[PDB]
Amino acid sequence: SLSDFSVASRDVNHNNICAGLSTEWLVMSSDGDAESRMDHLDYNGEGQSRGSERHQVYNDALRAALSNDDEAPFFTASTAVIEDAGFSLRREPKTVHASGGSAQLGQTVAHDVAQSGRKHLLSLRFANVQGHAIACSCEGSQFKLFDPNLGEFQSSRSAAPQLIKGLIDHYNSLNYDVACVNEFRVSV
Numbered sequence: 001s002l003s004d005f006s007v008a009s010r011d012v013n014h015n016n017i018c019a020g021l022s023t024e025w026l027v028m029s030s031d032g033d034a035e036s037r038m039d040h041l042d043y044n045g046e047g048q049s050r051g052s053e054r055h056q057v058y059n060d061a062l063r064a065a066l067s068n069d070d071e072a073p074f075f076t077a078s079t080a081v082i083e084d085a086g087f088s089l090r091r092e093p094k095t096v097h098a099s100g101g102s103a104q105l106g107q108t109v110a111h112d113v114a115q116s117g118r119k120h121l122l123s124l125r126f127a128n129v130q131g132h133a134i135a136c137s138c139e140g141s142q143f144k145l146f147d148p149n150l151g152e153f154q155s156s157r158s159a160a161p162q163l164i165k166g167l168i169d170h171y172n173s174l175n176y177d178v179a180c181v182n183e184f185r186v187s188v
Contacts, residue, residue, distance in 0.1 A: 001166065002153070005145075005154060005155050005166065006150075006153055007034040007035075007151075007153060008033075008037065008038040009151040010038035010041070010042060010150075011148075011150065012038065012041045012043065012148055013148035013149045014043070015052065017051055017054075017055035018132055018134070019054070019055055019077070019081050019121070019123075019133040020050075020051040020053065020054035020055025020056070020057070020058055020081065021047070021048075021054075021148040022122075022133045022135035023082055023084075023085050024047050024050050024054055024085075025037065025047075025051075025135050025146040025152075026119055026137065026186070027085050027086070028047075029119075029135075030137070030139065034144075038151055041148075054084065054085065055081070057081050061076060061079075061080030061081065062074065062076070062077035065077055072093075074123065074131065075093045075182070078093070078121055078123060078133070078182070078184050079184065087119070087188055088187060089185065089186060090185040090186060093182050093184050094112060094183040094185075095180050095182050095183075096108050096109050096180060096181045098177070098180060102165045102172070103161070105165070105178070106162070106163075106165030106166075107161045109122075109164050109181055109183070110157075110160040110161040110163075110164050112183055112185075113143075113160070113185075114138055114143045114160035114161075115138055116138055116140055116141075117139075118137070118138050119135075119137045119186050119187065120135065120136050120137075120183055120186065121133060121135050122182065122183055122184065123182040124171065124181055125178065125182065126177060126178060126179065127176075127177035128176070128177070132148075132149070132176075134146060134148065138157060141156055142154060142156070143155050143157050143159075143160045143163070145164075145167070
């Protein structure tokens with residue numbers, strides 16, 4: 001179950017600033033513990049304001065991309081927010097389609113993100129054209145995943161496929177069909 005992987009439950013996305021919050025989490029994903037990280041990103045925390053500021057960087061880049069008729073405006077915006085945070089894209093953004101069961105999707109994504117040292121900003125493309133950003137960082141055998149709507153989750157690299165499948169099923173159960181997942185592999 002998804003709750004089995006939960007280490008710090010916290011819905012910190014009431015203000016719809018997911019990309020910004022996810023990037024802020026990436027910046028300090030190794031600081032303190034899961035609980036303190038969620039306290040940082042919570043509404044009365046500095047992280048909520050910093051995340052909002054980062055989300056504005058995302059929005060600014062998106063607005064410019066759309067105005068310039070960019071071929072991939074969302075890829076451009078996501079790249080802008082992670083670069084603003086001091087990261088650089090390590091690979092071309094990868095798109096994993098939901099073709100097949102959620103286990104397959106979870107497995108493919110896990111193979112890409114659950115590798116020691118890798119960090120990612122991920123975008124969930126809800127069939128209803130709506131997007132949602134989350135982030136993850138793999139520290140040795142420890143895989144950490146943060147979803148602004150839910151909080152922080154952790155698993156061994158071995159169980160990452162189960163954790164990701166759980167997240168996908170969570171959204172599908174709420175009628176937010178995850179058509180695909182875009183991966184933004186980053187490094188400092």
